[PDB]
Amino acid sequence: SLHMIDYKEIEVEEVVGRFGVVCKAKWRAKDVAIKQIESESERKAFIVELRQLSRVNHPNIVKLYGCLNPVCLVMEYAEGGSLYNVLHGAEPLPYYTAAHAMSWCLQCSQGVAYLHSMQPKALIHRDLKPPNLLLVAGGTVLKICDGSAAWMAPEVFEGSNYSEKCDVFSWGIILWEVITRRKPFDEIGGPAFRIMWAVHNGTRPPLIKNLPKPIESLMTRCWSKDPSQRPSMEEIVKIMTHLMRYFPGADEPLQYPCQHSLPPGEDGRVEPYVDFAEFYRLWSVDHG
Ligand SMILES: */C=C/C(=O)Nc1ccccc1Oc1nc(Nc2ccc(N3CCN(C)CC3)cc2)ncc1Cl
């Protein structure tokens, strides 16, 4: 169910970054992101990617508009950049709230669950990380697309036959990342294998001061060593959906500046970046 575009319609603008190269473009009075081919050697790689980018259609997944000469791909241009850039990119960094953090994660679990539910075979993302999570609509709508050791389940680089529960591990790490606005395992550093060794040994990001026990529970379950003890994405979506009742305001665009500074990890427990005062407030009104 694809679409063809005269490569003469594509108004190739400038490059944006990088498999292949990605260039901002225009096409039918809209902004568009195109993914050129780098050499003949990548002909086959582009193929498998387009077999699944047609099957897939979901709000929280990058839309493929539709062309092939030279091998190209026509996708929607997320003006907001990567979530990684929002969290840790070049200053000025935008200010965001606890509701933004939860909405981003909710929207991500929604997109992954659609892939896990794909027929006939469940499509596994295998590389869930903020660099691959793009933002649109003032940074309020997250969308998925295609040094990952920080977000990698310990059974993946273990070579074991893995499943879709490795994305659940990634999601868990991402939830800790938007709440703390910290790069996971930035203290370890070194080459990737030094993080792989740490996570494989059981190391996890530190716990968050004054984190709601429901959120702490879900986060830790998602990054259990035993994949079968991690919840399904369907379960994550459900839980995140019902928690949003206590996180209003995910619709407000990111527009306010932020001079963000990072306290060191004093005593194995880190301070969150977002504020949960409004959550404990709304929660007590329903309970007590
Ligand atoms: C979809 C997976 C993926 O890898 N996306 C992606 C990552 C990095 C670069 C390009 C990519 O592609 C797309 N990019 C966009 N939109 C976009 C806008 C701006 C930026 N910049 C601006 C600032 N610099 C410093 C860094 C990032 C990146 C991306 N939209 C769609 C797609 Cl497919």
Side-chain angles (χ1 to χ4, degrees), residues 16-18 22 33-34 62 75-82 85 90 131-134 143-146:
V16 178
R18 295 184 186 174
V22 181
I34 54 166
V62 60
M75 309 159 292
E76 46 175 342
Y77 171 71
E79 186 134 295
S82 75
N85 196 232
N132 300 136
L133 310 175
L134 309 176
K143 293 196 181 192
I144 310 165
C145 50
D146 304 331

PDB file of all heavy atoms in Angstrom, residues 16-18 22 33-34 62 75-82 85 90 131-134 143-146, ligand 1:
ATOM      1  N   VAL A  16      20.359  16.600   7.658  1.00  0.00           N
ATOM      2  CA  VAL A  16      20.000  16.702   9.064  1.00  0.00           C
ATOM      3  C   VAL A  16      20.866  15.804   9.937  1.00  0.00           C
ATOM      4  O   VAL A  16      21.194  16.167  11.073  1.00  0.00           O
ATOM      5  CB  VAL A  16      18.505  16.379   9.271  1.00  0.00           C
ATOM      6  CG1 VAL A  16      18.137  16.431  10.748  1.00  0.00           C
ATOM      7  CG2 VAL A  16      17.644  17.349   8.474  1.00  0.00           C
ATOM      8  N   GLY A  17      21.246  14.634   9.435  1.00  0.00           N
ATOM      9  CA  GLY A  17      22.070  13.724  10.215  1.00  0.00           C
ATOM     10  C   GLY A  17      22.108  12.347   9.590  1.00  0.00           C
ATOM     11  O   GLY A  17      21.914  12.191   8.379  1.00  0.00           O
ATOM     12  N   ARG A  18      22.366  11.350  10.432  1.00  0.00           N
ATOM     13  CA  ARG A  18      22.419   9.960   9.988  1.00  0.00           C
ATOM     14  C   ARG A  18      22.026   9.014  11.119  1.00  0.00           C
ATOM     15  O   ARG A  18      22.096   7.794  10.975  1.00  0.00           O
ATOM     16  CB  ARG A  18      23.819   9.609   9.473  1.00  0.00           C
ATOM     17  CG  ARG A  18      24.221  10.376   8.225  1.00  0.00           C
ATOM     18  CD  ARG A  18      25.564   9.936   7.673  1.00  0.00           C
ATOM     19  NE  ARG A  18      25.978  10.789   6.562  1.00  0.00           N
ATOM     20  CZ  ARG A  18      27.156  10.712   5.950  1.00  0.00           C
ATOM     21  NH1 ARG A  18      28.057   9.817   6.334  1.00  0.00           N
ATOM     22  NH2 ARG A  18      27.432  11.537   4.948  1.00  0.00           N
ATOM     23  N   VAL A  22      19.880  11.446   5.974  1.00  0.00           N
ATOM     24  CA  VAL A  22      18.527  11.980   6.062  1.00  0.00           C
ATOM     25  C   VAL A  22      18.594  13.471   5.777  1.00  0.00           C
ATOM     26  O   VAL A  22      19.383  14.192   6.398  1.00  0.00           O
ATOM     27  CB  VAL A  22      17.898  11.708   7.441  1.00  0.00           C
ATOM     28  CG1 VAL A  22      16.481  12.261   7.499  1.00  0.00           C
ATOM     29  CG2 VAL A  22      17.900  10.212   7.734  1.00  0.00           C
ATOM     30  N   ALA A  33      10.891  14.625   5.282  1.00  0.00           N
ATOM     31  CA  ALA A  33      12.212  14.069   5.530  1.00  0.00           C
ATOM     32  C   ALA A  33      12.455  12.920   4.564  1.00  0.00           C
ATOM     33  O   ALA A  33      11.615  12.020   4.440  1.00  0.00           O
ATOM     34  CB  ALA A  33      12.341  13.583   6.975  1.00  0.00           C
ATOM     35  N   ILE A  34      13.599  12.952   3.885  1.00  0.00           N
ATOM     36  CA  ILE A  34      13.942  11.941   2.894  1.00  0.00           C
ATOM     37  C   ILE A  34      15.236  11.258   3.310  1.00  0.00           C
ATOM     38  O   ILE A  34      16.123  11.873   3.913  1.00  0.00           O
ATOM     39  CB  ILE A  34      14.071  12.545   1.480  1.00  0.00           C
ATOM     40  CG1 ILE A  34      15.062  13.711   1.486  1.00  0.00           C
ATOM     41  CG2 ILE A  34      12.708  13.007   0.985  1.00  0.00           C
ATOM     42  CD1 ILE A  34      15.495  14.147   0.109  1.00  0.00           C
ATOM     43  N   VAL A  62       6.303   6.703  12.700  1.00  0.00           N
ATOM     44  CA  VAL A  62       6.598   7.651  11.631  1.00  0.00           C
ATOM     45  C   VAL A  62       5.834   7.266  10.374  1.00  0.00           C
ATOM     46  O   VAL A  62       5.837   6.104   9.947  1.00  0.00           O
ATOM     47  CB  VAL A  62       8.112   7.716  11.376  1.00  0.00           C
ATOM     48  CG1 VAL A  62       8.660   6.350  10.977  1.00  0.00           C
ATOM     49  CG2 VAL A  62       8.429   8.761  10.312  1.00  0.00           C
ATOM     50  N   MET A  75       9.218  10.355   4.187  1.00  0.00           N
ATOM     51  CA  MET A  75       8.570  10.252   5.485  1.00  0.00           C
ATOM     52  C   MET A  75       8.240  11.647   5.996  1.00  0.00           C
ATOM     53  O   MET A  75       8.733  12.656   5.486  1.00  0.00           O
ATOM     54  CB  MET A  75       9.465   9.522   6.497  1.00  0.00           C
ATOM     55  CG  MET A  75      10.016   8.192   6.001  1.00  0.00           C
ATOM     56  SD  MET A  75      11.486   7.676   6.908  1.00  0.00           S
ATOM     57  CE  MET A  75      12.668   8.921   6.382  1.00  0.00           C
ATOM     58  N   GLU A  76       7.396  11.692   7.024  1.00  0.00           N
ATOM     59  CA  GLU A  76       7.021  12.964   7.629  1.00  0.00           C
ATOM     60  C   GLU A  76       8.197  13.555   8.396  1.00  0.00           C
ATOM     61  O   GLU A  76       8.968  12.836   9.037  1.00  0.00           O
ATOM     62  CB  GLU A  76       5.818  12.784   8.559  1.00  0.00           C
ATOM     63  CG  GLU A  76       5.911  11.598   9.512  1.00  0.00           C
ATOM     64  CD  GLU A  76       4.745  11.535  10.480  1.00  0.00           C
ATOM     65  OE1 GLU A  76       4.049  12.559  10.648  1.00  0.00           O
ATOM     66  OE2 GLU A  76       4.517  10.455  11.064  1.00  0.00           O
ATOM     67  N   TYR A  77       8.330  14.878   8.325  1.00  0.00           N
ATOM     68  CA  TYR A  77       9.445  15.586   8.948  1.00  0.00           C
ATOM     69  C   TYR A  77       9.026  16.059  10.334  1.00  0.00           C
ATOM     70  O   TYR A  77       8.259  17.018  10.468  1.00  0.00           O
ATOM     71  CB  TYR A  77       9.888  16.763   8.085  1.00  0.00           C
ATOM     72  CG  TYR A  77      10.899  17.663   8.762  1.00  0.00           C
ATOM     73  CD1 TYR A  77      12.204  17.238   8.972  1.00  0.00           C
ATOM     74  CD2 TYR A  77      10.548  18.936   9.191  1.00  0.00           C
ATOM     75  CE1 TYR A  77      13.130  18.056   9.591  1.00  0.00           C
ATOM     76  CE2 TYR A  77      11.467  19.761   9.811  1.00  0.00           C
ATOM     77  CZ  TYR A  77      12.757  19.316  10.008  1.00  0.00           C
ATOM     78  OH  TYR A  77      13.677  20.134  10.624  1.00  0.00           O
ATOM     79  N   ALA A  78       9.535  15.389  11.365  1.00  0.00           N
ATOM     80  CA  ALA A  78       9.304  15.801  12.746  1.00  0.00           C
ATOM     81  C   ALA A  78      10.150  17.033  13.038  1.00  0.00           C
ATOM     82  O   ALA A  78      11.358  16.937  13.258  1.00  0.00           O
ATOM     83  CB  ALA A  78       9.637  14.661  13.702  1.00  0.00           C
ATOM     84  N   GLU A  79       9.509  18.204  13.042  1.00  0.00           N
ATOM     85  CA  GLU A  79      10.233  19.452  13.244  1.00  0.00           C
ATOM     86  C   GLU A  79      10.885  19.530  14.619  1.00  0.00           C
ATOM     87  O   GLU A  79      11.826  20.311  14.802  1.00  0.00           O
ATOM     88  CB  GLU A  79       9.284  20.636  13.050  1.00  0.00           C
ATOM     89  CG  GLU A  79       9.961  21.997  13.105  1.00  0.00           C
ATOM     90  CD  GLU A  79       9.519  22.911  11.978  1.00  0.00           C
ATOM     91  OE1 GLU A  79       9.805  22.589  10.804  1.00  0.00           O
ATOM     92  OE2 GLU A  79       8.879  23.945  12.263  1.00  0.00           O
ATOM     93  N   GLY A  80      10.418  18.734  15.582  1.00  0.00           N
ATOM     94  CA  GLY A  80      10.925  18.811  16.940  1.00  0.00           C
ATOM     95  C   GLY A  80      12.231  18.090  17.192  1.00  0.00           C
ATOM     96  O   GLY A  80      12.830  18.281  18.254  1.00  0.00           O
ATOM     97  N   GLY A  81      12.690  17.273  16.250  1.00  0.00           N
ATOM     98  CA  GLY A  81      13.901  16.510  16.454  1.00  0.00           C
ATOM     99  C   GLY A  81      13.663  15.303  17.344  1.00  0.00           C
ATOM    100  O   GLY A  81      12.532  14.940  17.679  1.00  0.00           O
ATOM    101  N   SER A  82      14.768  14.673  17.736  1.00  0.00           N
ATOM    102  CA  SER A  82      14.701  13.494  18.584  1.00  0.00           C
ATOM    103  C   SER A  82      14.381  13.883  20.021  1.00  0.00           C
ATOM    104  O   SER A  82      14.721  14.974  20.487  1.00  0.00           O
ATOM    105  CB  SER A  82      16.024  12.729  18.550  1.00  0.00           C
ATOM    106  OG  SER A  82      17.014  13.401  19.312  1.00  0.00           O
ATOM    107  N   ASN A  85      17.474  14.758  21.782  1.00  0.00           N
ATOM    108  CA  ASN A  85      17.890  16.147  21.635  1.00  0.00           C
ATOM    109  C   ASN A  85      17.128  17.052  22.597  1.00  0.00           C
ATOM    110  O   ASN A  85      17.704  17.982  23.172  1.00  0.00           O
ATOM    111  CB  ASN A  85      17.688  16.592  20.185  1.00  0.00           C
ATOM    112  CG  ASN A  85      18.441  17.864  19.852  1.00  0.00           C
ATOM    113  OD1 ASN A  85      17.868  18.819  19.329  1.00  0.00           O
ATOM    114  ND2 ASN A  85      19.734  17.883  20.155  1.00  0.00           N
ATOM    115  N   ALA A  90      21.468  20.430  22.529  1.00  0.00           N
ATOM    116  CA  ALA A  90      22.106  21.734  22.651  1.00  0.00           C
ATOM    117  C   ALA A  90      21.177  22.728  23.332  1.00  0.00           C
ATOM    118  O   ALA A  90      19.986  22.811  23.015  1.00  0.00           O
ATOM    119  CB  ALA A  90      22.506  22.258  21.272  1.00  0.00           C
ATOM    120  N   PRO A 131      16.955   8.573  20.902  1.00  0.00           N
ATOM    121  CA  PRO A 131      17.415   8.987  19.564  1.00  0.00           C
ATOM    122  C   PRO A 131      16.481   8.572  18.441  1.00  0.00           C
ATOM    123  O   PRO A 131      16.462   9.226  17.389  1.00  0.00           O
ATOM    124  CB  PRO A 131      18.785   8.308  19.447  1.00  0.00           C
ATOM    125  CG  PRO A 131      19.276   8.244  20.834  1.00  0.00           C
ATOM    126  CD  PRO A 131      18.059   7.995  21.691  1.00  0.00           C
ATOM    127  N   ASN A 132      15.703   7.506  18.627  1.00  0.00           N
ATOM    128  CA  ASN A 132      14.765   7.033  17.619  1.00  0.00           C
ATOM    129  C   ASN A 132      13.326   7.426  17.924  1.00  0.00           C
ATOM    130  O   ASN A 132      12.410   6.960  17.240  1.00  0.00           O
ATOM    131  CB  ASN A 132      14.867   5.514  17.476  1.00  0.00           C
ATOM    132  CG  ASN A 132      16.253   5.059  17.070  1.00  0.00           C
ATOM    133  OD1 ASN A 132      16.782   4.089  17.612  1.00  0.00           O
ATOM    134  ND2 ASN A 132      16.854   5.763  16.117  1.00  0.00           N
ATOM    135  N   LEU A 133      13.108   8.267  18.932  1.00  0.00           N
ATOM    136  CA  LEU A 133      11.785   8.784  19.265  1.00  0.00           C
ATOM    137  C   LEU A 133      11.739  10.249  18.851  1.00  0.00           C
ATOM    138  O   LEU A 133      12.403  11.093  19.461  1.00  0.00           O
ATOM    139  CB  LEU A 133      11.496   8.625  20.754  1.00  0.00           C
ATOM    140  CG  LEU A 133      11.750   7.235  21.335  1.00  0.00           C
ATOM    141  CD1 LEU A 133      11.547   7.242  22.841  1.00  0.00           C
ATOM    142  CD2 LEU A 133      10.852   6.198  20.677  1.00  0.00           C
ATOM    143  N   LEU A 134      10.963  10.546  17.815  1.00  0.00           N
ATOM    144  CA  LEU A 134      10.838  11.897  17.291  1.00  0.00           C
ATOM    145  C   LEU A 134       9.561  12.548  17.815  1.00  0.00           C
ATOM    146  O   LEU A 134       8.606  11.873  18.207  1.00  0.00           O
ATOM    147  CB  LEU A 134      10.839  11.883  15.760  1.00  0.00           C
ATOM    148  CG  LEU A 134      11.990  11.104  15.111  1.00  0.00           C
ATOM    149  CD1 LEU A 134      11.829  11.070  13.598  1.00  0.00           C
ATOM    150  CD2 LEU A 134      13.345  11.691  15.489  1.00  0.00           C
ATOM    151  N   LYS A 143       6.591   9.915  18.273  1.00  0.00           N
ATOM    152  CA  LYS A 143       6.460   8.974  17.172  1.00  0.00           C
ATOM    153  C   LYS A 143       7.740   8.163  17.045  1.00  0.00           C
ATOM    154  O   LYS A 143       8.844   8.703  17.170  1.00  0.00           O
ATOM    155  CB  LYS A 143       6.153   9.694  15.853  1.00  0.00           C
ATOM    156  CG  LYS A 143       4.778  10.351  15.815  1.00  0.00           C
ATOM    157  CD  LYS A 143       4.369  10.691  14.392  1.00  0.00           C
ATOM    158  CE  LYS A 143       3.015  11.377  14.341  1.00  0.00           C
ATOM    159  NZ  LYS A 143       2.492  11.458  12.949  1.00  0.00           N
ATOM    160  N   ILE A 144       7.579   6.866  16.793  1.00  0.00           N
ATOM    161  CA  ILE A 144       8.700   5.942  16.709  1.00  0.00           C
ATOM    162  C   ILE A 144       9.156   5.843  15.260  1.00  0.00           C
ATOM    163  O   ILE A 144       8.417   6.156  14.323  1.00  0.00           O
ATOM    164  CB  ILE A 144       8.324   4.550  17.260  1.00  0.00           C
ATOM    165  CG1 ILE A 144       7.676   4.671  18.642  1.00  0.00           C
ATOM    166  CG2 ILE A 144       9.554   3.644  17.356  1.00  0.00           C
ATOM    167  CD1 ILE A 144       6.970   3.409  19.086  1.00  0.00           C
ATOM    168  N   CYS A 145      10.393   5.392  15.074  1.00  0.00           N
ATOM    169  CA  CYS A 145      10.945   5.180  13.743  1.00  0.00           C
ATOM    170  C   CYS A 145      12.123   4.220  13.856  1.00  0.00           C
ATOM    171  O   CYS A 145      12.515   3.808  14.952  1.00  0.00           O
ATOM    172  CB  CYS A 145      11.358   6.503  13.112  1.00  0.00           C
ATOM    173  SG  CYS A 145      12.382   7.522  14.191  1.00  0.00           S
ATOM    174  N   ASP A 146      12.694   3.872  12.706  1.00  0.00           N
ATOM    175  CA  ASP A 146      13.813   2.940  12.657  1.00  0.00           C
ATOM    176  C   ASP A 146      14.957   3.514  11.829  1.00  0.00           C
ATOM    177  O   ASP A 146      16.023   2.906  11.721  1.00  0.00           O
ATOM    178  CB  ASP A 146      13.367   1.597  12.074  1.00  0.00           C
ATOM    179  CG  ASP A 146      12.198   0.994  12.829  1.00  0.00           C
ATOM    180  OD1 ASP A 146      12.072   1.260  14.043  1.00  0.00           O
ATOM    181  OD2 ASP A 146      11.406   0.254  12.210  1.00  0.00           O
TER     182      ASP A 146
HETATM  183  C1  LIG B   1      13.140   7.696  12.567  1.00  0.00           C
HETATM  184  C2  LIG B   1      14.465   7.048  13.186  1.00  0.00           C
HETATM  185  C3  LIG B   1      15.599   8.032  12.988  1.00  0.00           C
HETATM  186  O1  LIG B   1      16.713   7.666  13.004  1.00  0.00           O
HETATM  187  N1  LIG B   1      15.248   9.424  12.773  1.00  0.00           N
HETATM  188  C4  LIG B   1      16.287  10.422  12.567  1.00  0.00           C
HETATM  189  C5  LIG B   1      17.323  10.543  13.524  1.00  0.00           C
HETATM  190  C6  LIG B   1      18.325  11.491  13.338  1.00  0.00           C
HETATM  191  C7  LIG B   1      18.298  12.327  12.190  1.00  0.00           C
HETATM  192  C8  LIG B   1      17.251  12.206  11.223  1.00  0.00           C
HETATM  193  C9  LIG B   1      16.250  11.274  11.412  1.00  0.00           C
HETATM  194  O2  LIG B   1      15.216  11.129  10.456  1.00  0.00           O
HETATM  195  C10 LIG B   1      14.127  12.010  10.639  1.00  0.00           C
HETATM  196  N2  LIG B   1      14.273  13.208  11.167  1.00  0.00           N
HETATM  197  C11 LIG B   1      13.233  13.996  11.314  1.00  0.00           C
HETATM  198  N3  LIG B   1      13.346  15.307  11.885  1.00  0.00           N
HETATM  199  C12 LIG B   1      14.566  15.873  12.503  1.00  0.00           C
HETATM  200  C13 LIG B   1      14.677  17.266  12.636  1.00  0.00           C
HETATM  201  C14 LIG B   1      15.818  17.832  13.226  1.00  0.00           C
HETATM  202  C15 LIG B   1      16.848  16.994  13.684  1.00  0.00           C
HETATM  203  N4  LIG B   1      18.085  17.565  14.323  1.00  0.00           N
HETATM  204  C16 LIG B   1      18.169  18.986  14.653  1.00  0.00           C
HETATM  205  C17 LIG B   1      19.351  19.353  15.582  1.00  0.00           C
HETATM  206  N5  LIG B   1      20.435  18.575  15.337  1.00  0.00           N
HETATM  207  C18 LIG B   1      21.453  19.030  15.975  1.00  0.00           C
HETATM  208  C19 LIG B   1      20.201  17.261  15.710  1.00  0.00           C
HETATM  209  C20 LIG B   1      18.814  16.747  15.288  1.00  0.00           C
HETATM  210  C21 LIG B   1      16.737  15.624  13.561  1.00  0.00           C
HETATM  211  C22 LIG B   1      15.583  15.055  12.967  1.00  0.00           C
HETATM  212  N6  LIG B   1      12.013  13.617  10.933  1.00  0.00           N
HETATM  213  C23 LIG B   1      11.781  12.440  10.397  1.00  0.00           C
HETATM  214  C24 LIG B   1      12.844  11.593  10.231  1.00  0.00           C
HETATM  215 CL1  LIG B   1      12.599   9.983   9.510  1.00  0.00          CL
END
